[PDB]
Amino acid sequence: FKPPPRPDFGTSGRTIKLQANFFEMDIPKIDIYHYELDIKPEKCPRRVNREIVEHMVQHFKTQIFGDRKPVFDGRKNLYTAMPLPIGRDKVELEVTLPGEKDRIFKVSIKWVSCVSLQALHDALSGRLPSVPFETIQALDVVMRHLPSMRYTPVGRSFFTASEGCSNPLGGGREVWFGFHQSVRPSLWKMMLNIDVSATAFYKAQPVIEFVCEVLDFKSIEEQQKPLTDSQRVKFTKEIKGLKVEITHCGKRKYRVCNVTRRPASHQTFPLQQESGQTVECTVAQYFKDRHKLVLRYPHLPCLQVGQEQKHTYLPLEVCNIVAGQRCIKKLTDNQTSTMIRATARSAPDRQEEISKLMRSADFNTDPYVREFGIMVKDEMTDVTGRVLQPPSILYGGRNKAIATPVQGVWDMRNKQFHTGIEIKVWAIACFAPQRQCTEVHLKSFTEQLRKISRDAGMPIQGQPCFCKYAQGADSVEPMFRHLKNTYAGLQLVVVILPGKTPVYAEVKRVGDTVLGMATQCVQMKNVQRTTPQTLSNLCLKINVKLGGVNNILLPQGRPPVFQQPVIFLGADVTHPPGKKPSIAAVVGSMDAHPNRYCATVRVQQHRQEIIQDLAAMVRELLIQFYKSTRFKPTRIIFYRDGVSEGQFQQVLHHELLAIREACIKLEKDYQPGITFIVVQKRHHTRLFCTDKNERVGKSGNIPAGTTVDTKITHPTEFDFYLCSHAGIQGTSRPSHYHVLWDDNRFSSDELQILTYQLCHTYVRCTRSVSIPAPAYYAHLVAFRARYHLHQALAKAVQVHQDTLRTMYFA
RNA sequence: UGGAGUGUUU
Ligand SMILES: [Mg+2]
Numbered sequence: 001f002k003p004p005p006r007p008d009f010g011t012s013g014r015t016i017k018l019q020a021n022f023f024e025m026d027i028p029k030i031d032i033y034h035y036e037l038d039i040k041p042e043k044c045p046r047r048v049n050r051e052i053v054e055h056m057v058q059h060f061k062t063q064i065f066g067d068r069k070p071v072f073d074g075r076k077n078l079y080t081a082m083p084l085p086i087g088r089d090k091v092e093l094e095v096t097l098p099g100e101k102d103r104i105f106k107v108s109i110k111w112v113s114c115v116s117l118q119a120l121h122d123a124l125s126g127r128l129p130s131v132p133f134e135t136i137q138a139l140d141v142v143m144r145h146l147p148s149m150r151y152t153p154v155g156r157s158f159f160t161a162s163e164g165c166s167n168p169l170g171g172g173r174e175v176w177f178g179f180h181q182s183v184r185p186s187l188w189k190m191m192l193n194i195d196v197s198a199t200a201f202y203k204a205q206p207v208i209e210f211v212c213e214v215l216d217f218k219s220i221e222e223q224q225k226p227l228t229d230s231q232r233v234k235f236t237k238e239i240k241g242l243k244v245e246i247t248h249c250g251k252r253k254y255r256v257c258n259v260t261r262r263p264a265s266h267q268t269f270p271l272q273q274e275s276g277q278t279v280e281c282t283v284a285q286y287f288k289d290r291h292k293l294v295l296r297y298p299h300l301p302c303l304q305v306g307q308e309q310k311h312t313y314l315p316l317e318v319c320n321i322v323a324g325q326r327c328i329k330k331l332t333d334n335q336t337s338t339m340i341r342a343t344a345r346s347a348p349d350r351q352e353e354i355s356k357l358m359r360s361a362d363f364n365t366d367p368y369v370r371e372f373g374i375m376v377k378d379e380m381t382d383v384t385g386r387v388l389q390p391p392s393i394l395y396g397g398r399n400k401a402i403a404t405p406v407q408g409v410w411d412m413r414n415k416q417f418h419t420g421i422e423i424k425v426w427a428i429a430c431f432a433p434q435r436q437c438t439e440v441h442l443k444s445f446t447e448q449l450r451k452i453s454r455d456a457g458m459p460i461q462g463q464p465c466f467c468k469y470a471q472g473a474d475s476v477e478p479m480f481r482h483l484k485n486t487y488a489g490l491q492l493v494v495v496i497l498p499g500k501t502p503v504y505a506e507v508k509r510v511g512d513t514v515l516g517m518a519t520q521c522v523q524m525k526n527v528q529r530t531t532p533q534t535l536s537n538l539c540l541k542i543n544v545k546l547g548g549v550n551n552i553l554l555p556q557g558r559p560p561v562f563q564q565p566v567i568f569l570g571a572d573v574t575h576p577p578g579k580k581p582s583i584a585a586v587v588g589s590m591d592a593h594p595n596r597y598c599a600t601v602r603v604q605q606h607r608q609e610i611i612q613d614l615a616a617m618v619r620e621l622l623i624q625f626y627k628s629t630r631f632k633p634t635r636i637i638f639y640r641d642g643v644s645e646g647q648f649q650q651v652l653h654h655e656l657l658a659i660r661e662a663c664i665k666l667e668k669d670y671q672p673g674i675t676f677i678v679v680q681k682r683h684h685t686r687l688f689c690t691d692k693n694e695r696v697g698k699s700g701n702i703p704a705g706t707t708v709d710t711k712i713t714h715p716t717e718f719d720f721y722l723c724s725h726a727g728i729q730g731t732s733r734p735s736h737y738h739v740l741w742d743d744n745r746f747s748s749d750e751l752q753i754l755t756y757q758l759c760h761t762y763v764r765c766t767r768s769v770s771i772p773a774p775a776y777y778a779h780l781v782a783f784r785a786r787y788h789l790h791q792a793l794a795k796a797v798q799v800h801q802d803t804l805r806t807m808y809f810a
Numbered sequence: 811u812g813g814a815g816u817g818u819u820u
Contacts (some may be wrong), residue, residue: 269820283820286820313820327818340818341816341817342817343818495811504811522811522812533813541813699815699816726815732815765813767815
């Protein structure tokens with residue numbers, strides 16, 4: 001029910017000086033005051049609500065508030081550093097906004113609470129059990145009140161349109177540069193977390209031009225013909241749900257709920273005439289008579305806004321995309337690459353950008369922050385980290401080599417798989433054009449693939465038993481039926497694909513869920529031109545797909561948790577961007593290495609973070625563990641990815657109980673110790689080497705193994721940061737781990753070391769990964785269920801029995 | 811789809 005306290009502080013690893021983007025806050029012990037604001041209408045946007053409260057405090061300067069500068073959260077929560085003359089008596093007041101008839105707003109104020117700040121600092125010293133959230137969020141409201149007025153808020157972030165501060169991405173989208181801000185508690189002090197942030201937005205422009213950027217028109221006049229049944233639906237997918245503003249009447253905002261089939265010249269709506277009889281009138285005709293405006297593009301469709309039942313249709317030429325709309329739809333591959341290139345900063349560069357943000361923010365001169373008597377240190381918090389020692393990786397073959405990770409990396413030169421697979425029969429299914437992928441390309445691809453295979457301990461015996469061409473979606477299952485039907489011991493089928501093709505999704509649906517054949521796809525370009533490293537990495541994926549063991553942790557280097565049988569679980573849920581369902585995935589370890597993992601997946605409610613069917617999922621994973629090892633886990637280690645702090649209790653409640661439920665349903669008195677660990681990549685905590693000498697790579701990031709659990713972590717609970725991976729490009733994201741439950745009384749060191757070692761068991765690469773393999777595999781499983789496409793959906797994701805005990809998701 | 815890591819009133 002309640003997260004355990006920090007047991008101790010880790011001492012493993014060599015110290016290292018670090019700086020964090022957490023800026024110390026000096027907070028007075030005063031007693032701040034809380035008021036509620038019932039604003040009528042109660043639906044108004046936060047943005048208007050802030051204007052209301054703005055003029056409301058200006059208008060009633062002498063009556064109510066005098067000279068005090070209160071802070072407003074945008075909804076109905078006002079704070080003051082001094083008591084107001086309200087005196088707990090509800091006071092109904094009036095507010096008038098300079099409108100277009102002007103607007104009138106009814107506002108009422110009342111004292112509701114007496115937030116104590118001294119009650120926070122003691123909680124920061126472990127004095128109290130928990131930390132009061134209402135006081136933390138009260139400070140947050142103070143620190144972001146001014147940013148929320150002068151910038152565009154987006155979650156905890158702030159953006160604007162200064163000097164462009166954006167790069168184009170195509171398709172009507174651009175990436176804006178802003179900054180994140182949050183108030184967070186730590187031991188003995190409150191911290192202000194500041195970071196740069198960049199998110200994708202829809203360019204503000206006329207919809208006509210949006211229709212050009214979407215689709216692909218160098219100029220609208222090139223399409224003087226009603227949009228095809230294809231251009232129309234693509235455009236519908238992009239603009240649906242976006243805000244638009246009128247540019248002809250008297251601006252005015254609307255939400256697009258659909259795009260009409262007909263053009264404006266023929267799209268009609270019922271118009272009631274003076275006499276009371278209703279008649280059908282075209283949008284073009286109505287814009288002629290009413291607004292005296294001949295549509296320039298009457299052959300184009302209309303934007304239906306408002307309720308889908310009502311018939312509010314707007315021509316494209318009178319609408320603009322409203323500025324400041326965060327793009328929440330999936331970005332095209334080319335769009336994300338542009339965003340990645342545009343937003344990647346080295347560690348030293350990002351550190352400076354944060355320092356610049358602090359200078360321009362100048363919190364120590366913000367009137368509202370000064371009003372509440374708060375101070376924000378200008379220097380980054382100093383932290384001592386620890387570089388945990390990596391584990392040794394044991395290989396096999398004849399040289400059974402022991403690799404030693406260096407800066408989060410190692411290779412397989414002069415090393416072979418731990419238990420490699422001997423492969424005799426295997427087919428090639430080249431779905432790419434023979435012209436680009438000629439028989440010479442296949443022969444040399446094969447030739448060099450077998451050379452790399454035998455060098456790694458996975459010898460590919462002889463030539464492929466089969467090698468033919470094909471194309472089309474419907475050509476897979478018939479050919480796959482044949483392949484299994486006519487080849488004894490068919491182990492692996494290599495598939496060649498051009499670029500982004502729908503053959504991949506169905507090649508997996510058939511090989512994973514229907515016939516159950518291990519498949520390995522590979523792009524055409526990686527056939528015409530082959531590299532040893534690419535061939536080597538390719539071999540990692542296919543050895544495990546056939547039950548191999550690429551390597552294992554050096555057994556004697558493991559933490560004592562491996563004394564008794566133990567199962568490691570990873571859990572993740574991937575959500576769509578209304579009818580699409582969420583996909584829950586839970587994987588479990590099936591040996592003591594731990595290397596092999598069995599997967600469970602479920603389709604559940606749209607955007608439900610809670611794993612609904614977790615108990616059933618855990619149950620079958622425990623059975624498979626018993627069937628694979630003939631042991632019953634004495635401990636269950638549960639790595640749960642992607643849960644914000646605001647959902648710890650909800651997930652802890654349902655999912656911790658579900659795990660317990662699966663144990664006792666198997667066996668009344670089976671009570672293994674559970675450890676529940678939330679793993680989070682989606683945060684803005686950033687660590688930088690204080691000494692240049694400790695920087696790693698061209699990015700200058702902290703080294704793999706860097707661990708922090710002292711000054712920026714929870715004042716009482718069991719949490720820590722572990723940057724287990726090597727920063728390649730940009731600035732490393734240190735993974736955060738929060739222990740919500742622990743029956744096994746883990747020490748700080750053993751859990752940190754265990755977590756670190758688990759990041760070295762990821763079989764797809766000879767590198768330490770940013771999260772433990774179980775959590776990573778869980779993400780891959782759910783991703784694979786997406787390519788697999790309520791009763792029918794569950795079976796589209798249900799996996800074939802033969803491929804129910806292998807690592808098909810690799 | 812070799813891989814990791816980097817940003818997310820009509
Ligand atoms: Mg997730």
